[PDB]
Structures are given as C-alpha cells and as structure tokens.
Amino acid sequence: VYNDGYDDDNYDYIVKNGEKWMDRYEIDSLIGKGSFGQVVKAYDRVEQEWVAIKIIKNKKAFLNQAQIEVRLLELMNKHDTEMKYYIVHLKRHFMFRNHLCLVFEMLSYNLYDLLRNTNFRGVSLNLTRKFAQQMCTALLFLATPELSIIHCDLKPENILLCNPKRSAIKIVDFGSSCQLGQRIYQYIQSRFYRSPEVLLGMPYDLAIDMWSLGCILVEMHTGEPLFSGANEVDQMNKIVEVLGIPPAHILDQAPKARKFFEKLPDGTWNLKKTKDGKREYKPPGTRKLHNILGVETGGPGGRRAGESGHTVADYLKFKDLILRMLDYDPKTRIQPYYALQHSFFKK
Ligand SMILES: O=C(O)c1nc2ccccc2c2[nH]c3c(I)cccc3c12
C-alpha cells in the first residue's frame, strides 16, 4: 500500500494508458523515466494539443527539488517569451494524486536516439556545428546576469529536436539546475560529462556546462563518449589520457586532489602510484584529440574520407574550439560569447 495504491515501491506513479486526469489530460503512454520520476505523453483536451507531462516522485526531497526547477523554468520562459533561445517551454504545473506534475510542449527525438539511429557512426560535422551554435547561444542566454543559471546536467539525452526532420533543438531537464548564488550540491553532472572542478570537489560556476558541451559535441560526431569512466577515478584518468595532468595551481586548491593524484617533494603533481607492473591507461596527454577526430585521416574511424564539409581545415577549427571548451581552468575556459565568434562558425 504505497500512496493508497497509486504508487509503486520507488515513489513513482503507476502509469495507466488511457487514464483521464481532471477532465483535461488523456494519458497516452510512458515516454521515459529518470531519477526524478517519469515523463508521459498526453492529449490536452482544453488546448487541443499533445503535451509531455513530467510526473515527479512522491517524496519530499524530489518534490522540493522540482519546485526549484519550476521557479527556474518560469524565470527563463518569461525572459524568452519568443521561444528563440532554445529552452523547453513549461506551460503549467499542478499537483495530482500527491505528485507534482509539470506540463511541457511536445518535442521529438533526443540526440542520443539520433546517434543510435546512425548505429553510433556519428552525425556529420555540418550537423554538429548547427547543434553547437544553438547550444552556445543557449548557454549565452543562461549566462545573462538576471538568470546566471547553471544547468548542471547537460548530456545528449537532455537535448531534443523540435521536429524529427529538422535541426532545431531545445534543452530539457533543469531538475538539478541552480543559480550562481544558490549552489546546494557537491556530486553533480552525469559522469561522462562531469567537469574536473566537480570531480575535484572545488567550487563551480557556469563554466561546467561548457565542459559538458565540449564532451557532447565530440561524441555527436564520433558516435561514442569522449571520456567514458566507470567511476570517478576512471573518469579522471580518462581525462588525463587526453589533456595531461591538471595544472598545479588548481590541484593545490582542490579538496579531492589526493583521490586521484599525489604531490611530489619537488612541488609537482602526478597520478597516484599504481601497483605491481599494472598498466591500464595511456600516459598523460598521449591520447591526442587530433587522432580521435581523425583530423588528417578522413575523420572518426576514417568514415568521412572524401566527403564534403569534412576538410582538414574544418577539422582543425573544430578541434581548436573543443580544446578551448576543455580548458582545465574554469577562469580561462571559453565562454559562450567568445565561442560564438570562433572561426568554426564562419559564414
Ligand atoms: O526533464 C524533462 O523534462 C524530460 N526528461 C526526460 C527524462 C527521460 C526521458 C524523457 C524525458 C523527457 N522527454 C521530454 C519531452 I518529449 C518534452 C519535454 C521534456 C521531456 C523530458
């Protein structure tokens, strides 16, 4: 007996297709689940349109976090009433059978579905550019002083197409977002997309979303995650394979530095000592992004050899942008405004 029979044993509402709510919403089916709860497809009788309804778990901690989501969505939606800045539209919310429900505009496939449809061969560099420009514009929007919003969980699954045959996108899931003042969490971001500062337990700001974006864009074009760690130690090591040891000025201020690294008497840092002649990672900085992207070898896995819009010059620009997004130092990591001016975006 959970919530008088309406809930399962993980605080979720037991969805029933064909159910009608408040003489208004006709529940078609379940679209998906997340840590927050569920999302369903529904027809709104009153407005004569399909909508997506996020059903938050019936548990205080989740309800309370979703209240923050609502505040942030409404705040974004009123600075962006023209819907031109790439953020999902929250139409309204309501409580129902002890669940907070958020009603959103209907959207199409997310970018992971999109990758999956190519069998993980990746999408064209032209399409990757289109997503990147939109995403940087969205981050510019979030960075406006009145908002100062950190999404905190960018990943391909949270970027959706508006229409299945078009390149327009919206960002969803501000369920762990916060504003630059009011930061309340420590372990955040999905692991593959998690920034060094968060891994290191350091204070974080809007620049963590740019880190994530850097990872996403590479994955969109290569078809696989750039840094696919199975836990925090693995994750940090995979980053180090590509970018080398993080600078001393950061590790010196990092509460969790010694979870991954050790400081030599001479004042420099290294990876923690490994056992016994075991070898698991490439040496620091030797896994070059140059090769991962196949800059001079026909793109990822050679698969773009002799296609248009995949020149060496194109790839070099793309690579420069990504490396600026993956700067270890959040003070110098490229910011949305300057990213939008990068040569990768030239008309
Ligand atoms: O955070 C969300 O709002 C969200 N989370 C999801 C989580 C898992 C699977 C699907 C999800 C999902 N589909 C959506 C559609 I279609 C339109 C608007 C929002 C969403 C959404």
Given a contact cutoff of 8 angstroms between Cβ atoms, the answer to whether 88 and 104 are in contact is yes
Q: Reported resolution in A?
A: 2.6
What is the number of domains present in the chain? Answer: 2
Are 99 and 43 in a shared domain? yes
Pocket-forming residues, ligand 1, beta carbon under 6 Å? 31-32, 34, 39, 52, 54, 88, 104, 106-107, 160, 172-173, 175
DSSP for 246-260, written as a single string: PPHHHHTT-TTHHHH
Given a contact cutoff of 8 angstroms between Cβ atoms, the answer to whether 93 and 103 are in contact is yes
| CATH code for position 20 | 3.30.200.20
Given a contact cutoff of 8 angstroms between Cβ atoms, the answer to whether 325 and 128 are in contact is no
Are 296 and 187 in a shared domain? yes
Distances in Å between the Cα of 158 and the Cα atoms of 95, 105, 113, 171, 188 are 24, 14, 11, 6, 15
Largest CA distance in the chain: 72
Residue with tokens 């008497």: 265
Confirm or deny that 36 is annotated as ligand binding. yes
Are 208 and 297 in a shared domain? yes
Are 96 and 231 in a shared domain? no
User: Which residue is closest in CA terms to ligand 1's atom 2?
Assistant: 173
Are 292 and 222 in a shared domain? yes
Distance 213 CA to ligand 1 centre (A): 19
What lies within 8 Å, CB to CB, of 241 at 6+ separation is: 281, 282, 283, 284, 285, 286, 287
Confirm or deny that 177 is annotated as ligand binding. no
| CATH code for position 255 | 1.10.510.10
What lies within 8 Å, CB to CB, of 90 at 6+ separation is: 70, 73, 74, 77, 102, 103, 104
- Give the nearest ligand 1 atom to 104 CA: 18
Are 300 and 153 in a shared domain? yes
Alpha-carbon gap, residue 83 to 75, rounded angstroms: 13
Distance 99 CA to ligand 1 centre (A): 16
Task: List, as own/partner pairs, every contact residues 5-9 make where C-beta atoms lie below 8 angstroms and the sequence separation is at least 24, other chains included.
Answer: 6/97, 6/98, 7/58
Are 233 and 344 in a shared domain? yes
Are 37 and 56 in a shared domain? yes
Distance 249 CA to ligand 1 centre (A): 39
- Give the nearest ligand 1 atom to 102 CA: 3
Q: Phi/psi at 26 (nearest 5 deg)? A: -105, 115
Q: Which domain holds residue 22?
A: 1-81+88-106
Q: Which of 40, 72, 106 is the last residue of a domain?
A: 106
- Token pair in block for residue 52: 């997506």
Q: What is the best residue among 173, 176, 190 to mutate for testing ligand 1's pocket, by most ligand atoms within 8 Å of CB?
A: 173
Are 172 and 251 in a shared domain? yes
Q: Which of 153, 173, 209, 314 is catalytic?
A: 153
Are 216 and 318 in a shared domain? yes
Are 20 and 51 in a shared domain? yes
Determine whether 113 is an active site residue: no
Are 238 and 289 in a shared domain? yes
Distance 172 CA to ligand 1 centre (A): 6
Q: What is the best residue among 54, 155, 162, 163 to mutate for testing ligand 1's pocket, by most ligand atoms within 8 Å of CB?
A: 54
Alpha-carbon gap, residue 248 to 252, rounded angstroms: 6
